[PDB]
Symmetry: C2
Subunit: 430 residues, 2 copies
């Protein structure tokens, strides 16, 4: 391909699982540990990653995963990371549901100035229902209305970012003209959900304004992202599904009058790289074995409801149970039955793999680089957002996979520039 | 006195005046210049200052002073400064009028974790009226209602900060107990202005929770600050007025059932320190002369409305105009008349001094240290918040005034600790 592949690094504290933090290598305080976040950010920058990504959440219970219980908030951790990094982008999740767009617009643009033009906004339209009750609302608006709110919120945020033209600040000490008043613009916005006069009290950044990311998956969300986003996150459940998503979103973007190459699609992967196939599998198994087996069998039991799995000896082959019946997730049960037979899995192993599935992107650096190249050449991805919950995985990826991609001409030898737009290959608007 | 005096440093970009940025020494981009903010923060830390302070604003027009037009937002710049400082506090202005307390609570507590327990909140109840129209409101609530909103907002913020007990996170890998569920508390708040279920998704910091600052000056604001604040900002218009403010607020705090020593009162000063009296006066005059004289005479004309000041030659003594009449600011006009006669000021000089008054805290390091000691011993101040708009003033203060205060036993030789509470002399609540 003519362009280069890009990577982002999701920094996610003690990770996305219930029990991964119990591994001997995991620092259980990682989610509020500034050293952990700084070290991961600098590892990603060493790998020339275009950005780091901080997810977010606004509602928890006693059953939330450990990372969700106690974690940094995104604009603060990204601003702190700006001071100890140089070129890597800083992408944070903020919802359109609660905060006023003037506040979000200021905070993102301020990060964009602090960082020299590296800010990005992952826009979330639909938080958990319970989040409404943390923000003085009885309930969230309905799906359709949440996307109308999000469109108006984003329009106001981008309108405010353009309050000042890029050359508005003359700073002429001799004449006393600090700014050119013809280059200052009030928004004067009076919409259904927001009324915002302006102007914003911060000007254009070195990349013009922050980059917008979105992870819309529904019909409505795919269309919203194709209309509005610079980059789109998606899943990597299969090459076929991701290829279909990519083609659909790129087509929708053309329908909206955009150049499809200006929308960069980033599936999420969590690769497990080791020097040998067996070593990588051993690392996967160490983490899959952390789940309390009774919890995994109980969750497995949801797909074989007509049986008590407790009578089956754990360390014997998975039973030829399953029959047919009919459950809302029955095609799941036949994939489970087929995999268990294909690899002669025990009941314990089936339970463990269901609680923590094995990534396709597992094995030698050469295999993982080749898979990544294949997805890139197949137009399933313009890049990947790399998770690294298992300790050492980001370091292994940067040290071992990146040099192969560089040697094959798919990855740059150094940063293209100092702004997120430049490193993603986007133009800067004014 | 038995305690030590403390200082904060207000970092304020190109400063608080209309024309100070035109001085040859001022960087006119300072207000969005990360290097400027980092250098000032590190100078204050060199001086063992207990905190830096970032003011804020939420509404501008073409006539706003240059710093207000284009400036960092506080939580972002404070988080960026956390990474490049060690012990100094990080105090930011946020209003209770627009943002939900869950958001403010998270962002402040996240800064408190990033920084190791150095966050502070300057709580503003009453922003400019125009700010309402930047946040989807027709108008701000009335004075009384703004303070009721602020009380409920603060109560929710502090309630959320106590969602987790300080020892809630067990992190027991062997048992799988990440937290003690008996040490997690929902707020379940249902008030007039806010409804917030909780819990917050971040735990206690190394100082428990952030410190609250307030600058209430009205009867209502003084009472609100005495009830709620750990530290209070005020003006330094005269020793007598500041002494009266100090005694009043300390008495109100005792009325609210608090130990008055747990409320630290910080008047604001902008000292101009030089090796000689004449050198310091020369620096003052360089900045006072920057104002376009027609603008200063026009503003001066508001106190002598029954005369055209344009007929009076600029460089002759100030005219014996003024008579009596009666204007809402007439006692001002007699102070002006009396000063102009006392120092034989020209019309130009009177205009310049009105546009930019000369601080009492001007002159040699020995004079400025002695004045500061006098205000401290007179119980006008527990410390001062130091402005340094004139380039070099913070450096001169740190290099020349601080060592005198240390030699006289009024200032520590090193930081008391790494948290803002410790350095202010406050206890930590749990």
């Amino acid at each position: 391909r003519a362009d280069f592949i890009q990577f982002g690094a999701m920094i996610h504290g003690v990770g996305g699982t219930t029990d991964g933090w119990r591994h001997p290598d995991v620092d259980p305080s990682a989610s509020t540990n500034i050293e952990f976040y700084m070290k991961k950010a600098q590892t990603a920058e060493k790998g020339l990653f275009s950005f780091i990504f901080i997810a977010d959440g606004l509602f928890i219970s006693e059953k939330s995963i450990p990372h969700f219980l106690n974690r940094f908030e995104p604009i603060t951790i990204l601003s702190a990371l700006a001071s100890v990094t140089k070129n890597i982008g800083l992408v944070g999740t903020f919802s359109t549901s609660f905060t006023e767009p003037f506040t979000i617009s200021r905070q993102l643009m301020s990060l964009d100035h602090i960082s020299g033009g590296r800010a990005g906004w992952n826009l979330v339209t639909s938080p958990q229902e319970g989040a409404a009750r943390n923000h003085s609302k009885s309930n969230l608006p309905e799906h359709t209305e949440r996307y109308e709110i999000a469109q108006e919120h984003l329009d106001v945020v981008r309108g405010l970012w353009n309050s000042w033209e890029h050359d508005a600040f003359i700073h002429n000490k001799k004449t006393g003209q600090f700014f050119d008043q013809a280059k200052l613009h009030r928004l004067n916005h009076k919409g259904k959900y927001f009324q915002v006069e302006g102007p914003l009290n911060i000007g254009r950044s070195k990349q013009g304004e922050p980059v917008v990311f979105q992870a819309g998956s529904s019909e409505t969300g795919r269309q919203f992202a194709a209309k509005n986003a610079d980059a789109i996150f998606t899943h990597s459940n299969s090459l076929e599904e991701t290829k279909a998503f990519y083609a659909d979103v790129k087509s929708r973007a053309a329908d909206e009058g955009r150049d499809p190459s200006s929308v960069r699609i980033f599936p999420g992967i969590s690769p497990i790289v080791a020097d040998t196939e067996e070593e990588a599998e051993k690392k996967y198994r160490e983490f899959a074995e952390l789940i309390p087996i009774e919890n995994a069998v109980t969750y497995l039991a949801r797909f074989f409801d007509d049986y008590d799995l407790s009578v089956y000896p754990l360390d014997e082959p998975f039973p030829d149970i399953g029959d047919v019946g009919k459950n809302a997730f029955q095609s799941t049960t036949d994939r489970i039955k087929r995999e268990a037979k294909a690899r002669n899995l025990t009941l314990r192993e089936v339970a463990q793999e269901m609680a923590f599935p094995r990534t396709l992107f597992i094995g030698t650096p050469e295999r993982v680089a080749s898979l990544i190249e294949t997805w890139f050449n197949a137009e399933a991805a313009d890049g990947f957002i790399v998770g690294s919950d298992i300790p050492g995985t980001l370091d292994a990826f940067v040290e071992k996979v990146i040099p192969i991609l560089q040697e094959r001409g798919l990855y740059r030898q150094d940063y293209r520039g100092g702004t997120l737009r430049e490193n993603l290959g986007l133009g800067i608007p004014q």
